[PDB]
Structures are given as structure tokens and as C-alpha cells.
Design a protein around this ligand. Structure first.
Ligand SMILES: COc1cc(/C=C/c2ccc(O)cc2)cc(OC)c1
Lengths: 115, 115, 115, 115
């Protein structure tokens, strides 16, 4: 799988488990079309979102449903979600890991792009 | 201003200057409507986007045009932009500072909310 | 001041107030010697640690006492402190802002260096 | 192994490979004693630092040699290194992952503590 999402919780020092993640791809008319989705595992990871065949060059949006995550833990958060928007390019390496570190009023994200 | 945006460059260790910022607000029909825009100053700050009168309750999206920033510096970065989505003023009027720290393959953002 | 420290709390979305900060400077014998200390204000800022005259070339360590901060708020955090170590003024005198963003199991830090 | 270190590069969007990491444990006389060390792998990870038998409760310091890493890449960095200082507690879960995200003028670190 060429696309993986990993989510960490900076308050508890743990994987962020059971977080909903929605991936979109931008359509010709400039709208976001649903592409893949799931919930993070006990390791904070979401695998199997797509295949090499389906993950063509394009503009993608990964939406991590952070507000619902903080609410489930009884903590008041700021963001509705975290959105990571990027162009997938075949020149670049094959595997994209989108990592996100969550706090109630802050998030960080990085891309780890490897072969 | 009840809404301020501050952007730092983690590669240079400097304010991120001349970064375009676009703010949108969700309309009743759930579409994003333009609300305000501007560019960061030599201090990395963008003041004067709105007024207490105009900054009513709503769901807002602050997009920071990070790709345009990096490309102007000869870096082909990963993200298209950094996008901060939040409900504002739902518990009464507040002052919001959206701070962002940029690297070519990573960003963070935090909100500082005061009375 | 040529050296300023600013600290934010990523859980509350606020300045981190009353955070103790200790600055050390390496001596010729490679031991850390006390250089300056203070506490962050209601704005999360600590000004006036030193002067241009006293802030000579050297290797400095800014320790931010994050454990004491969190414990005062009922959180048992992971780190003892956040420690920022750098050479200063080696390319001529500069102004340094050390910014830190705190969560109970995570911190970040960035330097903004200006003329 | 109850202690693992993972290091990422926020400029290249890659694991930070061949980074020296030194771990210390605080001695009774309040000095730092060498405990374990290594260099990160091609995956940015350093495994096998210690065993459960040797990793007793105590205060530990993980020092990630970031300056040497940036110099090897021809980039001018700010920090001498990144230091992560923490108390290991047997009440807490068994496995400590120290993760660090590096930029030339900024670093972030989080602890992921799991069973
Ligand atoms: C296996 O542990 C990991 C930790 C991390 C940590 C990421 C992170 C991102 C932003 C930050 O501010 C701090 C850490 C990323 C990973 O990507 C495969 C794996």
C-alpha cells in the first residue's frame, strides 16, 4: 500500500486509536471526491487505504477527525479536524506515510516519503 | 483584531514573510465562502483581517499558502497549504492567534485563544 | 534583550504562564555555569534575561522547567524539562527568540534569529 | 527492548539516517553516566539500546546529534543537539519510543509509551 496514516496523541503519549480518517482526491471540476477512509488501529495506524493501481498522480486530502477524538476523551479541542493536502508525484518515492501528532489546541504533521 | 495569523520558517529560523493567507467561513448551505485574506509582514504576522463586528460565530478555515511560499524560495515542498479549521466565538467573542511553523515536508499549527 | 523565551500550552491554547527558565553557558573547562534565569509572564514571555554586553559568544543551554509547569496543573508529564542548546553570536551579535510549545508528552522548540 | 528512538527529517520528508544517539542515566552524584548509544538505521530507527533487565527506574537523557546530521547534508543548523530528559517509571507501560522530528532551526519530540 502506497499510502499509510499514523496518528499520535501528545497528551497521553500514546497512539491515537479509533480516529476516523477520510481521504479525498480532487476531481476535474475542482471538487473533492471521496477516495478512501477508515479508523486508526490500536497502533494508531491505518493501512490498506489504497493500492498502487488506484493511487495515481493527483491532489489528495487526508482529513483526520480530531475533534471527535478529543470529545471521546472528554477534552475540549480547537480544530474541527486536521487536513493534509498534497500532490502525489510519480517522480517521488513510492510510499507516503502521513504522520500527525495531536494536542487539543495544536497539531503537527509530516510526510515520510520512501522507497 | 480578533483574528491574527503568525507564521515562522523552521529552515531559516525566521519569520515567514509574504505568505498569502485566505480565510473562509462556512455558509448556511455548508459551502465555504471567502471571508478575508492578506499576506504576512516582515515580522511573519498578519493583522487586520477582520473586525469584532464582522467576525461572528461560525466555522472558519484559515488557509496558509505554504506551497507558494516554498516555491518562491526554490524548494518543492510536500503540502499544497496548511489549513486550520475551527468553530469561532461559539462560547462568546474571543481573540484568536493562529500560529504556524513551516518546513518543506512538515507543518505545525497551534491556536492561542484569549479574552 | 538579545535573548527572549516564549512558551505556549498546546492543551489550553494559551500562553504558558509562570514557567521557570534557567539559562547556562559553557565555561572554558566545558562545565555548565549559571547565566540567567526567570519566569514567563502572563503573555508566556520572558524578557530581560541578559544584555548585549553580557551575552557574549558561547554555547548556551536554555532549560524550560516543563515538569514543574505541568505538575502545578495536575498533570504528571513525561519530560523533566525542555532543553535548547546552541552556539550564540559566533557569526556576530544576533537577537534570539526561543519559542516552545508544550504538551504533557511532547514539546517542540524553534529559534527565531534576527538582526 | 523497552527503549527505541525514531528520528525524522522535516526538510527532506524522510527518515533521518545515520544520526548519532547517546543515552545517559543520572548517577547518585547527579552526573550523567553513559548508558547506551548507536546510529539510526536506514529507517531512522535505533533498536537494541538496552534490555528490560538493565532499563531500571531512573532519570534518562537521550541526546540526538542533530548538528552533525545537518552539517553532513550541507545545511546550517541552530541546535547543538536535541536532548530528551525523562524519568522511567515502572507504573507506566513497558515500551518507550522517543520520536523526534528535525528541522534546521526547530525540533519536536514526543514519547509514545505502550504495552
Ligand atoms: C513509529 O513511530 C513513529 C513516530 C513518528 C512521529 C511523528 C511526529 C510528527 C510530528 C511531530 O511534531 C513529532 C513526531 C512518525 C512515524 O512515522 C512512521 C513513526
Amino acid at each position: 500500500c502506497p499510502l499509510m496514516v499514523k496518528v499520535l496523541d501528545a497528551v497521553r503519549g500514546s497512539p491515537a486509536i479509533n480516529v476516523a480518517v477520510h481521504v479525498f482526491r480532487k476531481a476535474a471540476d475542482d471538487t473533492w471526491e471521496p477516495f478512501a477512509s477508515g479508523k486508526t488501529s490500536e497502533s494508531g495506524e491505518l493501512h490498506g487505504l489504497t493500492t498502487e493501481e488506484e493511487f495515481v498522480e493527483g491532489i489528495y486530502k487526508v482529513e483526520i477527525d480530531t475533534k471527535s477524538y478529543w470529545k471521546a476523551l472528554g477534552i475540549s479541542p480547537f480544530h474541527e479536524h486536521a487536513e493534509v493536502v498534497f500532490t502525489a508525484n510519480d517522480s517521488g518515492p513510492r510510499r507516503y506515510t502521513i504522520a500527525a501528532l495531536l494536542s487539543p489546541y495544536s497539531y503537527s504533521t509530516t510526510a515520510v516519503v520512501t522507497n
